[PDB]
C-alpha cells in the first residue's frame, strides 16, 4: 500500500567525527610560513541554523596534530645550524663580581676554555659568561648537557616570536566551530558554524600562565576534563587580560668565535654596566581582582562556603615549577610565588615583582637528549604580554578538610594548544544518503 522505493541522494548535509591532517595558512622565523598557504582575505563562516553538535576539547585530535606540527617546525628550524660539539670541554670558571647585586651572586660564571679554530691544528684560548644553571662543577666546570647530548646553537637570524597559524580542513572535511559563549568545552553546543580555517593561533610556549592568547567574551571560564579528579589540570581563561612586563636589564655583549670553517659560536662577552636580576612586574590590584573572579568561578564547582587557597608550585623541573617563557630570544624562568600566595574566605600603583632566571641550554618539549643553545641577545631586553589564562592543579582534596588549594601547573604544551582549539572540531562529510520515495525507475 505504501509503494516506497530506495532513492539515492548525493550532496546530503551529513557528517561524522573524523581525524585527518589539517593544513597551514597564514597572512626568518621558527614557525615556518614559507610552507603555509596564503590565508583568504575574506574568510567565509557559514552559521548552521538548528545544528546542535557534540564537542569535547579533551579528545580533540587537532591538539595532537598541532603539537606534532609545532615540534616538527622547531626541529627543522634547528637543522641547518651549528652543532656545538666542540663546546664540551673543560671550563676554568671564576665568579663574576664586578657590579653585581646581592641577588646575582654566583649566578654568572666567567669561564675560559680552549676551543678549536678554522684550522684543524690550532687552538684558541677564549672565554664566555655562562649562567649558573648551565654549568656543573667537575674551579673546573662543564656545560650541563655534555653527559647527555651535544647541543645545537639556534641560528641567530631565526626569530622566536610567535606568528598566528590558521588550521584548515582538506576537501571532504569541515571544521565545526562552537560560537557558544559560556561554553566549557564538553557537551552539546547549540550554536555551531562551519569555517574553512581556524582563527590565527599563536604558538606561544609557556608554563603556569597562558600568554598572548584569546579571552573569554563573558566571564572567567573554568575548564577541566573531570573537575573532581585532582589529577586533571584546570584551564582558566580570563575575560580581561593581566599585563605582565618582563625585562632582562643587563646590557649584554655578544662576541663571535670561529670554531670551524664557517662555524661560529656566540659567546657572552661582558655586561656593560651594572649586573642585576631579570624580573617580571604584574599589577597587584589587577591580579587581585582577577583572582577574585577565578575564585568566584571555582566556588561554582567546589562549594559556596569553601575556602579557596592559592599556593606555590609543588616541585619538579625548573620548567614546571616556574613561569617559563621566551622574551625576545632569551629564555626566562620566573618565580611565581608572589602570584599564587593567598586564601579566600566566603563572605594603588605598586606591583608584584617576580624574580626570573635566564637559561641558554633549553629542552623545549618534554624530551631528553635533544637540547638547544640560545645565543646571547645584544643589549637590554624588555617585553610586555597579556596573561589570558592559567593552568592550575588542585591539591589533594580528601573529605577531611573544607579548604581547596590550587597550585600553578604546566609543562605539557598540549594544554596550551587546547586552550585555543577548545571550540573547534573536525568532521568528514558523508554526501551519500538513501531514503524512501514514491518514484520507481
Ligand X SMILES: *[C@@H]1O[C@H](CO)[C@@H](O[C@@H]2O[C@H](CO)[C@@H](O)[C@H](O)[C@H]2NC(C)=O)[C@H](O)[C@H]1NC(C)=O
Ligand Y SMILES: *[C@@H]1O[C@H](CO)[C@@H](O[C@@H]2O[C@H](CO)[C@@H](O[C@@H]3O[C@H](CO)[C@@H](O)[C@H](O[C@H]4O[C@H](CO)[C@@H](O)[C@H](O)[C@@H]4O[C@H]4O[C@H](CO)[C@@H](O)[C@H](O)[C@@H]4O)[C@@H]3O)[C@H](O)[C@H]2NC(C)=O)[C@H](O)[C@H]1NC(C)=O
Ligand Z SMILES: *[C@@H]1O[C@H](CO)[C@@H](O)[C@H](O)[C@H]1NC(C)=O
Q: Which is nearer to ligand Z, 106 or 172 (CB)?
A: 106
Q: Decide which of ligand Y, a second copy, ligand Z, none touches 328; Cβ closer than 5 to 8 Å per partner kind.
A: ligand Y
In Å, how far are 55, 156, 309, 353 from 345, measured between CA atoms?
Answer: 35, 50, 9, 25
> By rule CB under 6 A, what count of residues binds ligand Y?
18
Q: How many CB atoms lie within 10 A of CB 255?
A: 15
Does residue 321 interact with ligand X by CB under 6 A? yes
Q: Which is nearer to ligand Y, 294 or 377 (CB)?
A: 377
CA angle at 54 for the pair 52 and 55, rounded to the nearest 5°: 125
CB of 217 to ligand Y, least distance (A): 20
Under the rule (CB under 6 A), what is the footprint of ligand Z?
A: 95, 105-106, 136, 147-148, 184, 186-187, 251, 272, 337-338, 341, 379-380
Measure CA 321 to chain center: 15
Taking CB under 8 A as the criterion, the residue among 77, 128, 153, 247 binding a second copy is: 128
Distance of alpha carbon 415 from alpha carbon 209, whole angstroms: 11
Q: Decide which of a second copy, ligand X, ligand Y, none touches 243; Cβ closer than 5 to 8 Å per partner kind.
A: ligand X
CA angle at 190 for the pair 186 and 195, rounded to the nearest 5°: 85
- Residue count of the chain, please give it: 441
In Å, how far are 85, 207, 273, 275, 314 from 332, measured between CA atoms?
Answer: 25, 11, 21, 16, 19
Taking CB under 8 A as the criterion, the residue among 8, 37, 119, 285 binding a second copy is: 119
Does residue 258 interact with a second copy by CB under 8 A? yes
CB of 150 to ligand Y, least distance (A): 24
Does residue 256 interact with ligand X by CB under 6 A? no
From the list 7-15, 22-30, 174-182, 346-354, the region that binds ligand X by CB under 6 A is 346-354
Q: Decide which of ligand X, ligand Z, a second copy, none touches 195; Cβ closer than 5 to 8 Å per partner kind.
A: none
Q: Which is nearer to ligand Y, 404 or 415 (CB)?
A: 415
Phi/psi at 149 (5° precision):
-175, 160
Give the three-class secondary structure for 252: coil
Q: Which is nearer to ligand Z, 75 or 180 (CB)?
A: 180
Asked if 223 contacts 302 with a C-beta cutoff of 8 angstroms, the reply is no
Q: Decide which of ligand X, ligand Z, a second copy, none touches 380; Cβ closer than 5 to 8 Å per partner kind.
A: ligand Z
Of 81, 80, 89, which Cα lies nearest the Cα of 145? 89
Of 421, 422, 409, which Cα lies nearest the Cα of 206? 409
- 213-242 mask for ligand X (x: CB under 6 A)? --x----------x-xx-----------x-
Distance of alpha carbon 51 from alpha carbon 190, whole angstroms: 6
CB of 34 to ligand Z, least distance (A): 34
* Residues in contact with ligand Y by the rule CB under 6 A: 156, 159, 161-162, 204, 206, 211-212, 325, 327-329, 377-379, 383-385
Amino acid at each position: 500500500a505504501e509503494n516506497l522505493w530506495v532513492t539515492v541522494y548525493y550532496g546530503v548535509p551529513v557528517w561524522k567525527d573524523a581525524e585527518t591532517t589539517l593544513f597551514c595558512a597564514s597572512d626568518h622565523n621558527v614557525w615556518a610560513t614559507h610552507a603555509c598557504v596564503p590565508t583568504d582575505p575574506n574568510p567565509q563562516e557559514i552559521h548552521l541554523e538548528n545544528v546542535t553538535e557534540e564537542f569535547n576539547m579533551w579528545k580533540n585530535n587537532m591538539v595532537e596534530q598541532m603539537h606534532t606540527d609545532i615540534i616538527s617546525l622547531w626541529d627543522q628550524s634547528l637543522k641547518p645550524c651549528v652543532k656545538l660539539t666542540p663546546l664540551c670541554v673543560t671550563l676554568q670558571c671564576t665568579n663574576v663580581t664586578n657590579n653585581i647585586t646581592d641577588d646575582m651572586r654566583g649566578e654568572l660564571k666567567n669561564c675560559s676554555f680552549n676551543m678549536t679554530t678554522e684550522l684543524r691544528d690550532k687552538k684558541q684560548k677564549v672565554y664566555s659568561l655562562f649562567y649558573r644553571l648551565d654549568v656543573v662543577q667537575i674551579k673546573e666546570y662543564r656545560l650541563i648537557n655534555c653527559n647527555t647530548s651535544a647541543c645545537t646553537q639556534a641560528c641567530p637570524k631565526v626569530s622566536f616570536e610567535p606568528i598566528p597559524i590558521h588550521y584548515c580542513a582538506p576537501a571532504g572535511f569541515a571544521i565545526l566551530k562552537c560560537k557558544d559563549k559560556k561554553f566549557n568545552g564538553t557537551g552539546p553546543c547549540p550554536s555551531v558554524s562551519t569555517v574553512q580555517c581556524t582563527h590565527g593561533i599563536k604558538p606561544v610556549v609557556s608554563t603556569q600562565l597562558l600568554l598572548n592568547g584569546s579571552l573569554a567574551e563573558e566571564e572567567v571560564m573554568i575548564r577541566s576534563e573531570n573537575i573532581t579528579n585532582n589529577a586533571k589540570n584546570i584551564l582558566v581563561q580570563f575575560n580581561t587580560p593581566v599585563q605582565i612586563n618582563c625585562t632582562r636589564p643587563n646590557n649584554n655583549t655578544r662576541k663571535s668565535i670561529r670554531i670551524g670553517p664557517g662555524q661560529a659560536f656566540y659567546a657572552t662577552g661582558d655586561i656593560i654596566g651594572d649586573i642585576r636580576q631579570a624580573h617580571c612586574n604584574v599589577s597587584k590590584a589587577t591580579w587581585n581582582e582577577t583572582l577574585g573572579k577565578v575564585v568566584k568561578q571555582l566556588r561554582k564547582h567546589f562549594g559556596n562556603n569553601t575556602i579557596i587557597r592559592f599556593a606555590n608550585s609543588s616541585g619538579g623541573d625548573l620548567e614546571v615549577t616556574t613561569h617559563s617563557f621566551n622574551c625576545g630570544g632569551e629564555f626566562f624562568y620566573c618565580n611565581t610565588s608572589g602570584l599564587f600566595n593567598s586564601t579566600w574566605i566566603s563572605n594603588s600603583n605598586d606591583s608584584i615583582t617576580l624574580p626570573c632566571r635566564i637559561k641558554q641550554i633549553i629542552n623545549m618539549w618534554q624530551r631528553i637528549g635533544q637540547c638547544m643553545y640560545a645565543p646571547p641577545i645584544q643589549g637590554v631586553i624588555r617585553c610586555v604580554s597579556n596573561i589570558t589564562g592559567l593552568i592550575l592543579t588542585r591539591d589533594g582534596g580528601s573529605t577531611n578538610s573544607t579548604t581547596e588549594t590550587f597550585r600553578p601547573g604546566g609543562g605539557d604544551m598540549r594544554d596550551n594548544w587546547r586552550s585555543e582549539l577548545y571550540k573547534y572540531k573536525v568532521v568528514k562529510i558523508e554526501p551519500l544518503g538513501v531514503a524512501p520515495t514514491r518514484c520507481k525507475r
